[PDB]
Amino acid sequence: NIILDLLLLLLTIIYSYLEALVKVFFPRKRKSVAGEIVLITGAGHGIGRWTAYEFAKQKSRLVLWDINKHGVEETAAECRKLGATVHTFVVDCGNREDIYNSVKQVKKEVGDVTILVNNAGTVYPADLLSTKDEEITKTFEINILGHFWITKALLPSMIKRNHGHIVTVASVCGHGVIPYLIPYCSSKFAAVGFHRALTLELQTLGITGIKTSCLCPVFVNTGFTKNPSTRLWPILETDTVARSLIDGILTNKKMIFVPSYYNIYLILDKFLPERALAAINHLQNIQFEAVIGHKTR
Amino acid sequence: NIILDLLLLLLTIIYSYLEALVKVFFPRKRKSVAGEIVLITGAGHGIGRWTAYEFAKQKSRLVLWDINKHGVEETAAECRKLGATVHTFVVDCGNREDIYNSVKQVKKEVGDVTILVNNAGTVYPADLLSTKDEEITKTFEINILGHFWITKALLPSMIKRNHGHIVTVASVCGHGVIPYLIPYCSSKFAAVGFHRALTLELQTLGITGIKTSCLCPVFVNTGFTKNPSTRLWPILETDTVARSLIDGILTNKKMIFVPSYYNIYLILDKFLPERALAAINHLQNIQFEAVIGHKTR
Numbered sequence: 327n328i329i330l331d332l333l334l335l336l337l338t339i340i341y342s343y344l345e346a347l348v349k350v351f352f353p354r355k356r357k358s359v360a361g362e363i364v365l366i367t368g369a370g371h372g373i374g375r376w377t378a379y380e381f382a383k384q385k386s387r388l389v390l391w392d393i394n395k396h397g398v399e400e401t402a403a404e405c406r407k408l409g410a411t412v413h414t415f416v417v418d419c420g421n422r423e424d425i426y427n428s429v430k431q432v433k434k435e436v437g438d439v440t441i442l443v444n445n446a447g448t449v450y451p452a453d454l455l456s457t458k459d460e461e462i463t464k465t466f467e468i469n470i471l472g473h474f475w476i477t478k479a480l481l482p483s484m485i486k487r488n489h490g491h492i493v494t495v496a497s498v499c500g501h502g503v504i505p506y507l508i509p510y511c512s513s514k515f516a517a518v519g520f521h522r523a524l525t526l527e528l529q530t531l532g533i534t535g536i537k538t539s540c541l542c543p544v545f546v547n548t549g550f551t552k553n554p555s556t557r558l559w560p561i562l563e564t565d566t567v568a569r570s571l572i573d574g575i576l577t578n579k580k581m582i583f584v585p586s587y588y589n590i591y592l593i594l595d596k597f598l599p600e601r602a603l604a605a606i607n608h609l610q611n612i613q614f615e616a617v618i619g620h621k622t623r
Numbered sequence: 624n625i626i627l628d629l630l631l632l633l634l635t636i637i638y639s640y641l642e643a644l645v646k647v648f649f650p651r652k653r654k655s656v657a658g659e660i661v662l663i664t665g666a667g668h669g670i671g672r673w674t675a676y677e678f679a680k681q682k683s684r685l686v687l688w689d690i691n692k693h694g695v696e697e698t699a700a701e702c703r704k705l706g707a708t709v710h711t712f713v714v715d716c717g718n719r720e721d722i723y724n725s726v727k728q729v730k731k732e733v734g735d736v737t738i739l740v741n742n743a744g745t746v747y748p749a750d751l752l753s754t755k756d757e758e759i760t761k762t763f764e765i766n767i768l769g770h771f772w773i774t775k776a777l778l779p780s781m782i783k784r785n786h787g788h789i790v791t792v793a794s795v796c797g798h799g800v801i802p803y804l805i806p807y808c809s810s811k812f813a814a815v816g817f818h819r820a821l822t823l824e825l826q827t828l829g830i831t832g833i834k835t836s837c838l839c840p841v842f843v844n845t846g847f848t849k850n851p852s853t854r855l856w857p858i859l860e861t862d863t864v865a866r867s868l869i870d871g872i873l874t875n876k877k878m879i880f881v882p883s884y885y886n887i888y889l890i891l892d893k894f895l896p897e898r899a900l901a902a903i904n905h906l907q908n909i910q911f912e913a914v915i916g917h918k919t920r
């Protein structure tokens with residue numbers, strides 16, 4: 327228990343050092359994204375906002391989508407200070423009709439998107455019996471169904487030119503699960519499944535030019551969940567996540583975990599017995615605001 | 624290419640007789656389901672139909688749901704020949720309003736469901752750009768969102784009595800992916816995520832009496848997909864799947880793969896490099912009717 331803690335800390339330290347060593351010994355080649363038309367959904371705040379900043383520094387043409395007009399204009403203002411050409415659109419990324427109508431505007435005013443970042447997301451932390459049905463559907467409408475509509479609208483051009491990049495922002499909740507997040511984990515598993523099946527179908531059809539990347543961070547300090555706490559995982563800073571994402575996109579990395587040492591916990595979750603996984607679970611002590619038993623705890 | 628077939632044939636034969644050895648050395652205790660109120664969705668045909676037959680032989684009280692009244696009555700007729708008490712209801716298991724209204728009828732006419740089998744499902748095989756948006760939503764409405772509505776309606780009683788069993792019929796498509804099945808794989812990943820997060824939340828809340836099982840089969844000969852063909856996996860007969868499901872429920876098995884040796888391919892998909900996975904993929908030669916490039920291939 328105390329020694330399990332130290333074991334997990336030493337493995338975390340070994341992974342961190344060894345990965346940093348491989349990044350100097352065998353570095354992956356970075357591609358250029360200058361001049362690419364990058365569409366980022368949920369770009370009005372958090373991961374989407376700081377990912378837009380990274381693409382502005384990379385010299386890409388930006389198309390930012392969000393339901394929050396004020397936020398998306400604040401992001402665009404900063405991207406323009408970084409020297410980027412930005413187009414903002416107020417779009418509900420859970421509404422199919424809104425998505426298709428807005429893609430028509432993007433083609434007319436900007437052109438054909440070459441990099442798509444499906445970042446927009448929502449969460450309503452509560453135990454299954456404290457969830458509202460409307461909140462469950464909204465979670466799927468934004469976290470996964472929106473990915474289908476945007477990808478179907480933007481893929482035709484990418485296939486024609488044999489050139490594109492589809493980034494799916496999922497979560498470690500798309501590989502592992504957390505209590506009081508059943509609809510969220512369910513929708514994030516669907517996002518991982520979509521990325522994996524889209525990657526394979528493109529391979530099967532012989533489409534060599536369209537790359538895919540899946541972003542899977544642990545808790546990030548954006549306010550997405552109120553006051554998160556994990557003993558074994560870090561509460562990430564937004565800029566760190568955006569930096570890891572841009573590094574992964576530029577090197578065509580398919581599955582980007584943040585921090586990369588989450589892979590150790592991923593392997594433990596597949597081979598460890600139930601008793602061992604419950605011991606790690608208690609040590610983790612996950613905390614965050616949620617509605618438990620119809621009361622916000 | 625050549626030795627690769629017998630390399631996988633060996634890992635299949637070895638698993639088959641090591642599992643049979645563990646079933647004698649460390650046997651799992653089978654529980655009784657006699658007198659339990661078992662609700663099976665999609666019980667009008669295939670896996671749901673033959674699972675109803677297995678529960679009829681187990682002496683449970685059956686509640687069968689399906690959109691096909693003729694088919695669900697044909698299943699009930701056979702369960703009654705097996706000596707079981709069966710109640711049939713025509714329910715759209717993708718329609719939330721229909722689900723809640725029907726749960727009110729089940730409580731009034733039958734009582735409180737203790738075993739829930741979420742089996743109803745749908746598939747529209749096509750490449751992403753040949754899919755219809757209506758087909759994508761229908762896949763999620765039945766394959767995952769219906770699980771949320773039925774489980775939320777039936778869980779309160781199970782928690783009050785600290786006694787229940789939630790069975791999620793997912794697929795190997797909820798762990799691995801197959802091209803031309805992006806919405807299907809995505810919705811099956813969401814079903815696996817729901818089972819895993821439901822299992823953890825019940826554990827976290829101290830609910831010791833509610834068990835969870837997840838049925839993940841390879842292709843089953845039900846007509847669900849047209850003329851399926853797999854070289855390394857068998858095309859399972861429906862009765863085999865129903866037998867494996869009943870054996871897993873009676874021993875409280877959380878993840879039931881059919882055949883159980885799919886676990887070898889599951890581990891190969893996590894540790895083998897891209898080159899080796901594409902070599903096994905070609906050897907697999909998965910075939911089934913699907914709309915490819917707006918043409919039925």
Ligand SMILES: NC(=O)c1ccc[n+]([C@@H]2O[C@H](COP(=O)([O-])OP(=O)(O)OC[C@H]3O[C@@H](n4cnc5c(N)ncnc54)[C@H](O)[C@@H]3O)[C@@H](O)[C@H]2O)c1
Nearest residue numbers: 368370371372373392393418419446447497545546548550
């Ligand atoms: N924050 C975390 O702890 C965390 C961890 C893992 C994964 N993620 C994922 O990262 C993504 C971004 O989360 P974040 O932490 O940056 O959140 P955030 O709250 O900082 O920002 C999310 C943004 O998405 C926008 N958005 C919400 N619904 C939308 C809709 N219907 N249409 C358009 N835009 C919409 C919001 O307006 C907001 O600007 C999400 O997909 C989330 O699930 C977050």
Ligand SMILES: NC(=O)c1ccc[n+]([C@@H]2O[C@H](COP(=O)([O-])OP(=O)(O)OC[C@H]3O[C@@H](n4cnc5c(N)ncnc54)[C@H](O)[C@@H]3O)[C@@H](O)[C@H]2O)c1
Nearest residue numbers: 665667668669670689690715716743744794842843845847
């Ligand atoms: N057959 C396979 O190859 C296969 C493989 C893996 C997983 N599965 C899964 O097993 C489950 C059952 O498949 P099957 O092969 O037995 O199919 P099937 O087509 O033989 O039977 C499915 C049944 O579900 C019913 N159903 C469909 N939509 C419904 C709805 N809205 N409400 C109520 N009932 C509904 C149908 O009327 C039918 O009786 C599905 O979830 C499927 O995804 C099947």
